[PDB]
Amino acid sequence: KKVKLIGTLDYGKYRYPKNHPLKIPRVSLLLRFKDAMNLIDEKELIKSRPATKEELLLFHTEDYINTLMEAERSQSVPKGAREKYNIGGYENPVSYAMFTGSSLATGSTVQAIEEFLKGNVAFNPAGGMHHAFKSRANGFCYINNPAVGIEYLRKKGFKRILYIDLDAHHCDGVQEAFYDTDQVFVLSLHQSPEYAFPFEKGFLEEIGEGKGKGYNLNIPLPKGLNDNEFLFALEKSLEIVKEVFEPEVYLLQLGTDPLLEDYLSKFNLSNVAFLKAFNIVREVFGEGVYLGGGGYHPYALARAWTLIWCELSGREVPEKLNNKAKELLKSIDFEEFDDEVDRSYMLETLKDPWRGGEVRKEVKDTLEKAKA
Numbered sequence: 001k002k003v004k005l006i007g008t009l010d011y012g013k014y015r016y017p018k019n020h021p022l023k024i025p026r027v028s029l030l031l032r033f034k035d036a037m038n039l040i041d042e043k044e045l046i047k048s049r050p051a052t053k054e055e056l057l058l059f060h061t062e063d064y065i066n067t068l069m070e071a072e073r074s075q076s077v078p079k080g081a082r083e084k085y086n087i088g089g090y091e092n093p094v095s096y097a098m099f100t101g102s103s104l105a106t107g108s109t110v111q112a113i114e115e116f117l118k119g120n121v122a123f124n125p126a127g128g129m130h131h132a133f134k135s136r137a138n139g140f141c142y143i144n145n146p147a148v149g150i151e152y153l154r155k156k157g158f159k160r161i162l163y164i165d166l167d168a169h170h171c172d173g174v175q176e177a178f179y180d181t182d183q184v185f186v187l188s189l190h191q192s193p194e195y196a197f198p199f200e201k202g203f204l205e206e207i208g209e210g211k212g213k214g215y216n217l218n219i220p221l222p223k224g225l226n227d228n229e230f231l232f233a234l235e236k237s238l239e240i241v242k243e244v245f246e247p248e249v250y251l252l253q254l255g256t257d258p259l260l261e262d263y264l265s266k267f268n269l270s271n272v273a274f275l276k277a278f279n280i281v282r283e284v285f286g287e288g289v290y291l292g293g294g295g296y297h298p299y300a301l302a303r304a305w306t307l308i309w310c311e312l313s314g315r316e317v318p319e320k321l322n323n324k325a326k327e328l329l330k331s332i333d334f335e336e337f338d339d340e341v342d343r344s345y346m347l348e349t350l351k352d353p354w355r356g357g358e359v360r361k362e363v364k365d366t367l368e369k370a371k372a
């Protein structure tokens with residue numbers, strides 16, 4: 001049983017435009033980081049491969065895929081593509097990330113899956129692009145690696161696939177994709193749609209359609225969410241799943257945006273709570289395929305995913321970051337959103353302190369209605 005990390009420094013060449021949250025290095029940055037912390041070896045890394053047209057078609061429609069391919073190389077927005085495919089906008093602009101990086105991130109999810117099925121443990125930090133629809137770009141996403149991955153498994157015969165999304169936002173793409181089926185159970189904790197993207201979906205009431213009614217569970221959570229609240233809903237919502245679904249396999253997306261320092265989230269979570277959310281899912285359902293997801297703060301991103309890597313890699317977490325790592329992080333131009341909050345403290349340790357607190361009624365009500 002090997003523990004593999006799927007990645008490449010090439011993502012770093014497929015960034016989104018300056019004015020875009022995804023303009024920064026992310027997975028390429030994770031690799032440089034753990035290499036600087038000496039927490040990864042060559043024999044544990046798997047080079048990302050591009051998803052084949054066929055694999056993408058296990059979910060996405062040809063016209064939508066050909067539109068992506070055409071738009072990228074001509075580096076343009078084709079006539080009627082903006083409207084029909086939600087491509088070209090600020091949200092999902094034209095770039096080399098729209099198809100080449102997306103395909104790369106997607107092939108890595110299948111790679112991650114192939115590995116798991118070989119009896120190994122893999123983590124694909126570039127995957128977890130859960131917003132894309134069958135024929136539409138959405139929320140920075142063009143290709144839905146999770147859906148594509150899940151369909152991959154269905155073709156391999158699995159009939160009870162589980163998907164847990166701990167990313168701060170609802171995986172509306174993953175939801176629409178298996179909303180009418182009961183072979184795939186979709187579960188998601190995220191910022192309530194009442195105040196956060198997607199805004200149009202993610203509400204507790206969305207429990208399915210047809211045979212799938214009861215196989216989609218959304219856990220809308222309040223702003224200022226603290227560690228205890230987060231963990232509370234996880235353990236609690238996982239329970240609802242176990243009494244209703246016996247998984248043959250499950251995927252977990254681990255976006256680091258729920259963390260306190262990430263601006264695209266109103267949650268004030270910590271690394272440790274994040275790490276624990278992870279281990280709790282593993283305690284309940286065993287090992288599964290681990291995916292990446294949203295994350296916009298270079299420091300949180302790096303420290304957080306490094307914890308996941310250590311946990312998997314069975315290696316102790318250095319309590320501090322050596323100089324090579326501190327310098328790396330400081331070399332990235334990110335520009336803090338809130339002028340000066342000062343996040344240099346993140347450079348003084350890998351595991352930050354707990355940010356627990358009481359558990360608001362809201363959360364307990366949310367869970368209770370989800371239970372009922």
Ligand SMILES: O=C(CCCCCCC(=O)Nc1ccccc1)NO
Nearest residue numbers: 021139140167168169197264294295
């Ligand atoms: O990370 C996500 C959500 C992506 C959608 C975020 C869109 C909102 C947006 O445009 N925000 C923004 C843009 C520039 C600078 C800061 C925030 N999925 O989990």
Ligand SMILES: [Zn+2]
Nearest residue numbers: 167168169294
């Ligand atoms: Zn997110």
